[PDB]
Amino acid sequence: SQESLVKLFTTNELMRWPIVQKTYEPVLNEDDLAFGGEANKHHWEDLQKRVIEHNLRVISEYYSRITLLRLNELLDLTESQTETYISDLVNQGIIYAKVNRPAKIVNFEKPKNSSQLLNEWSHNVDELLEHIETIGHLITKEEIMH
Amino acid sequence: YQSRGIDAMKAVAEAYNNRSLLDFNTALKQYEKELMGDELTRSHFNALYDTLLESNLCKIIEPFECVEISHISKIIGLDTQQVEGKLSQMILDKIF
Amino acid sequence: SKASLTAARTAANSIYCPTQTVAELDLMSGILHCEDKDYKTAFSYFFES
Amino acid sequence: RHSNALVDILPPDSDSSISVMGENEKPDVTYADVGGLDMQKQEIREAVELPLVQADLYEQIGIDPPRGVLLYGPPGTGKTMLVKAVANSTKAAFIR
Amino acid sequence: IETVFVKNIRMLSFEDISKATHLPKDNVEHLVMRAISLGLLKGSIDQVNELVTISWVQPRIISGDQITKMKDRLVEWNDQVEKLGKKMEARGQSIWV
Amino acid sequence: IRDEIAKNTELSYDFLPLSNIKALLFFNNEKETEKFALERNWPIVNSKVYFNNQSKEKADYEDEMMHEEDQKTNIIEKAMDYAISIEN
Amino acid sequence: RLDRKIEFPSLRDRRERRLIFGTIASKMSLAPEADLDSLIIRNDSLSG
Amino acid sequence: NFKEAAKLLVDSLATFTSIELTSYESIATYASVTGLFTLERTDLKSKVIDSPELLSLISTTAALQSISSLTISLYASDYASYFPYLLETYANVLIPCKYLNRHADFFVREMRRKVYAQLLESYKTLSLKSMASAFGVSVAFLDNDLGKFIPNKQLNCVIDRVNGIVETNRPDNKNAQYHLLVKQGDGLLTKLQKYGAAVRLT
Amino acid sequence: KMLMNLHKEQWQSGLKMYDYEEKEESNLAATKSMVKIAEQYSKRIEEEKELTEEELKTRYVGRQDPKKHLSETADETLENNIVSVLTAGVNSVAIK
Ligand SMILES: Nc1ncnc2c1ncn2[C@@H]1O[C@H](COP(=O)(O)OP(=O)(O)O)[C@@H](O)[C@H]1O
Ligand SMILES: [Mg+2]
């Protein structure tokens, strides 16, 4: 019960809110004082916030630009709820996104600098070259011996 | 001592603490004459009003990029023309 | 306003001048510092007056 | 090392003593911890700090700029306190 | 992984994938996301521009024809090194003067 | 005059109805207007002209020649010629 | 030398006693049971 | 020149002698107009309007009142009363005054440009229609006034007539630094050419 | 030939354009530093018709001459920037 529950959020992966809501209601309401207390029944509402918050962090890595219309399916929340739950996350400083209020697009990516983007090209070119050097003596080795 | 401006002080103070321009806007209109009644009260309450609007405005627009000004006026609770004229004045200073 | 606020203290001998004039003199410091954006100094004068 | 000759200079470390206190061990007292004494504060601020901030201002007038500043009063008046504050906001060297 | 990689263009629209894996577009993105998690690819998903732009690949299966596609791919850029190697040599009259 | 307006009208339009090209370059048959179009290598497909198509092929003609490559002057060439004046 | 000569009060008006008692409130929020104003009266010679 | 005359005039408001010199009322009014010409709207309010030796006289003639009403309303971003106050300033400051009846045209050009400059850095793709109703002017005059300055590039802005949209394309970017740097480095080059060649012949 | 050696990293460092963060910094720093000594180059030559080479350097403080230093700075940043644009353009055109 514990095993399945935990691994979902440990690993970076998309797991929809309605699958958690349905499945894990009968499993976890049995144990008291986290989901089956009377003061902790209303911690099922706080299960909802965490799954979708997880969903948004995973999506942040994996997308870099997404429409808002797609994103409502990904979280299963409506348009109004999606925009609002992103905007608070910018205040707690977990993400940086730019949120377009007419229901347009939401971009979880960063303003960049000319320099930074070409640092990656600096690395791809070096590493590519590195490979050409290693390859060159491995070819000779297999040439003589085989 | 008791005046209508003693009533003003408590209304305004509570409004500024809330961050509510709605409570503020109402208070400024009903207690307009108490502000006319003294120069010092008058100068500082409008510098308090301008700054209250500014401060609350940055939060709405904090994600940035294509935010409706209909969305803005909702939160703010004031007419569109009032909000748009603030928006032009502040862009000019260049503070966003 | 400052130039002649200072001149007031110098031409008086403290606040040993009639208690009423001191009210009026404290009130006037009160306005001036409030405009300079010192509101601890403005509040303190205004209470005395 | 192998044969003495002069090749480089260093920052001064000797023949002038250490009696400084830095900005890395500066007092935690500031003008904000200063409660009372607000009339006299302005004159100290003008006497110490302003030549630093606006030297040009002195020149314009062509006034010989201020020099020593006696602070005085009976004890417990807060003199040491005031000058702790001067040391943070001067943004410059300090010798006590 | 096979369809984008086998091409010399490294960035590919979701549509071509959709008829290939006999799945609609909604599952395309989910397939792509699952790979990244599993540490089989690293890259991005864009449902704005509708692109998958991959940038790291885990080793492909060996087959003669995969070999052939690698060997042909080096040809393309072998030309550039060789032609440039003549231009730079000739040019410069103060190479050690 | 007819050959001169074709030159002007590459930059002006991206496509035109076959009745519009007809009015502009002055012709009394549509056999003349399309003959004139296919001289300027513009497909007459969809019943619209496509001026951009000739522009592509003029650019390729230029790239094959070695008169266009050094006019551009590449950045490897500019630096090396820059370097040898100094060391001269 | 010796240009600026700064005087301090040390008996203190009520105005200046209040300010240094006011340092307590700035420093940390205080109880409605507390009254600072009680302390300003009883003083007669009390510096900071 | 007006640029320098802003400095000069405000500093003669500090200390003035009226014996064998113009009225004070004149200096105060002149001082306001010069402020407009030299300064941007942001620094209008700090350096001319708040000067305390312009607010000791306040206003005491028609000419100071018309100019004072204009200056503030331009910073305040009420352009409703602005175009009406332009009419007043024409009437009372340009024509009676001898020195300003000589830049009676130059004033009109300047102050239309100046208004247009405040909106167009603070607005992008706005209607002509929206702008006319605000201004209190007709639409037809507005189309024509903006096109005076577009060809000289003091707006750097272009106007869709088709939908009434007024576009904004202002430089302020990397390209802007590039244009300034090249105008200087082109002038340096021309100088190096002529001077070098001269020294070489002799 | 043995004593000297030929390095295998001689060919790798030729074909690598260094990080661009360090390059914005390089150009920015260098061009700014030459303003401080450009100004002093004028003051040196206000007169030059005066006799004795040491003399020129003693009047206006031309010690470790601003002509020699400023030129040197111009030749040495210039050598690096030509080589850097060269390496960058080589890699992009070569590899793909
Ligand atoms: N204006 C003030 N605000 C707060 N505390 C003050 C003030 N003036 C003095 N004090 C207090 O008095 C203490 C002792 O004063 P100090 O500056 O050492 O005095 P003096 O040199 O006048 O004998 C300070 O550490 C501070 O706690
Ligand atoms: Mg002491």
Swiss-Prot record, chain B:
N-acetylated by NAT1. Transmembrane segments: none annotated. Coiled coil: none annotated. Present with 16800 molecules/cell in log phase SD medium. Belongs to the proteasome subunit S9 family. Component of the lid subcomplex of the 19S proteasome regulatory particle complex (also named PA700 complex). The 26S proteasome consists of a 20S proteasome core and two 19S regulatory subunits. Component of the lid subcomplex of the 26S proteasome, a multiprotein complex involved in the ATP-dependent degradation of ubiquitinated proteins. In the complex, RPN6 is required for proteasome assembly. This is 26S proteasome regulatory subunit RPN6. It comes from Saccharomyces cerevisiae (strain ATCC 204508 / S288c). The chain holds residues 291 to 386 of 434 of the full protein.
UniProtKB/Swiss-Prot annotation, chain D:
N-acetylated by NAT3. ATP binds at G73, P74, P75, G76, T77, G78, K79, T80. It comes from the Eukaryota. It is found in: Cytoplasm; Nucleus. The 26S proteasome is involved in the ATP-dependent degradation of ubiquitinated proteins. The regulatory (or ATPase) complex confers ATP dependency and substrate specificity to the 26S complex. Belongs to the AAA ATPase family. This is 26S proteasome regulatory subunit 6B homolog. The gene is RPT3. The chain holds residues 141 to 236 of 428 of the full protein.
From Swiss-Prot, chain E:
Belongs to the proteasome subunit S11 family. Acts as a regulatory subunit of the 26S proteasome which is involved in the ATP-dependent degradation of ubiquitinated proteins. Present with 12400 molecules/cell in log phase SD medium. This is 26S proteasome regulatory subunit RPN9. The lineage of its organism: Eukaryota, Fungi, Dikarya, Ascomycota, Saccharomycotina. The gene is RPN9. The chain holds residues 297 to 393 of 393 of the full protein.
Swiss-Prot record, chain I:
Signal peptide: none annotated. The keyword Metal-binding applies. GO terms for cellular component: cytosol; mitochondrion; nucleus; proteasome complex; proteasome regulatory particle, lid subcomplex; proteasome storage granule. One of its GO terms (biological process) is proteasome storage granule assembly. N-acetylated by NAT3. Keywords: Acetylation, Hydrolase, Metal-binding, Metalloprotease, Protease, Proteasome, Thiol protease, Ubl conjugation pathway, Zinc. The keyword Acetylation applies. GO terms for molecular function: cysteine-type deubiquitinase activity; metal ion binding; metal-dependent deubiquitinase activity; metallopeptidase activity; proteasome binding. It comes from the Eukaryota. Present with 16400 molecules/cell in log phase SD medium. Component of the lid subcomplex of the 26S proteasome, a multiprotein complex involved in the ATP-dependent degradation of ubiquitinated proteins. RPN11 is the only catalytically active member of the lid and serves as the essential deubiquitinase of the proteasome. Belongs to the peptidase M67A family. The JAMM motif is required for the deubiquitination and degradation of ubiquitinated substrates. Component of the lid subcomplex of the 19S proteasome regulatory particle complex (also named PA700 complex). The 26S proteasome consists of a 20S proteasome core and two 19S regulatory subunits. Interacts directly with RPN8 and STS1. This is Ubiquitin carboxyl-terminal hydrolase RPN11.
